[PDB]
Amino acid sequence: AMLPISMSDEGDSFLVKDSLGENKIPKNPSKVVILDLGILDTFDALKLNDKVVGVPAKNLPKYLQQFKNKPSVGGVQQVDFEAINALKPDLIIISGRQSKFYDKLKEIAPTLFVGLDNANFLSSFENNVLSVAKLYGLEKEALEKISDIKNEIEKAKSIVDEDKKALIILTNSNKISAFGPQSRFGIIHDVLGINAVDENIKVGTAGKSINSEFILEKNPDYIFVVDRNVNKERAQGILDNALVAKTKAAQNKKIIYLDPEYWYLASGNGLESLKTMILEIKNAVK
C-alpha cells in the first residue's frame, strides 16, 4: 500500500508526510500551483478557486474551464519551472505523473503528493481530499462531499449484474492494450464491482498487448474503451471487424466509449470528476 498523507498541527502550519517526503505547509495556503487535474477539481468543489495561482492550462479539459485563465505552468506532460518560480507559490500539489519532478518542485515551495493507489483507490481519494481540506479547515464540507460519492458508488454497485464480465481496453491508432483490476482504470472492477473477463492481467502501465481474436476469445459482456486517439483512426474503426462483431458486447451495443478527459487524465481526485466517472459506468451498465 502507498503510504498515506499524515499531518500534525503545529499552530500556523502542518508538518506533512507523504510517500515522497516531508514538508512544512502553512495553514490556509494562498498561492497554490496544482499539477493534478483531479485535485484542481476538488479545489473547485471546496470553494478554493481563489487559492489557485497556477495550472496546467495546455491540456485543460472541458470540465475545468473555470481555470483556463489562470497562469499556465505546463501541460499533461511538461512542466514550466520558470513559470512556477515566478508565481512564488506557497504550495505545489502533484500526483503520480509529476513524481519525476519532485526534487526540482520542492526547491521552489512545499510539494504535496496526492497519489492514487491503484490497489486502494477509495482510501487514497479520501485521504487526498481530506488532507487538502485540513489545510483550510474544511473537513466538514469535504466529509459531506465524500459521503455523496460513497452514496453514488453504492447506488452504482446495486445495479451491477453479478454474471456479466467486462474488458477494459486502451486504443491507439493500430494497437489495443488490455487493463484489469488494480490498474489505473481499475475502479470499474475494484470500486464498482463489475467482474473482469481476465482478473490476471499483469500489473503495469502499458497493459497487455492484445488483438481482436483475444476479445472474441474472452467474449465480454461489456467492453470499456479509453481511446487515446482522442489521429483520424478511432477505436470504433479498430473494433470494426467481424471478430469483435460476434461478441456479446457488440451485439448488445455495450461497447462503451469512455471520455478520455476523465479516464486517461486520471481525474479521480476530483470530488465532482470522480462522481462523473461513477455515473458514466452506472449509466452504461444499468
Residue numbers in the entry: 22 to 251, 255 to 310
Could you share sentences copied from the article?
The periplasmic binding protein (PBP) CeuE1 is an important component of the Fe(III) uptake system in Campylobacter jejuni, a commensal Gram-negative bacterium in the avian gut, but a common source of food poisoning in humans. CeuE, an integral part of the CeuBCDE ABC transporter of C. jejuni, is responsible for capturing Fe(III)-siderophore complexes in the periplasm for delivery to their respective inner membrane transporter. C. jejuni does not itself synthesize siderophores, but capitalizes on their secretion by other bacteria, such as E. coli. Here we report a combined solution and structural study of a series of synthetic tetradentate analogues of the enterobactin-derived bis(2, 3-dihydroxybenzoyl-L-Ser), to explore the ligand-binding promiscuity of CeuE, both wild type and with mutations of the Fe(III) binding residues H227 and Y288.
To probe the relative contributions of His227 and Tyr288 to Fe(III)-siderophore binding, site-directed mutagenesis was then used to replace the side chains of the two Fe(III)-coordinating amino acids with non-coordinating side chains of similar size. His227 was mutated to either leucine (H227L) or alanine (H227A), while Y288 was mutated to phenylalanine (Y288F). All five mutants (Y288F, H227L, H227A, H227L/Y288F, H227A/Y288F) were crystallized in their apo form, and all structures are closely similar to that of wild type CeuE. However while there is clear electron density for the Y288F mutation in its three structures, H227L and H227A are located in a flexible loop region and there is generally no electron density to confirm their presence. In contrast, the effect of mutating the histidine was less pronounced. Mutants H227L and H227A gave Kd values of 22 ± 10 nM and 35 ± 14 nM, respectively, indicating only slightly weaker binding than for wild type, which indicates that the tyrosinate O-donor binds the Fe(III) cation more strongly than the histidine N-donor. The Λ-configuration signal was observed for mutants H227L and H227A, indicating that these do indeed bind Λ-Fe-5-Lic. The resulting Kd values show trends similar to that observed for wild type, but with systematically weaker binding.
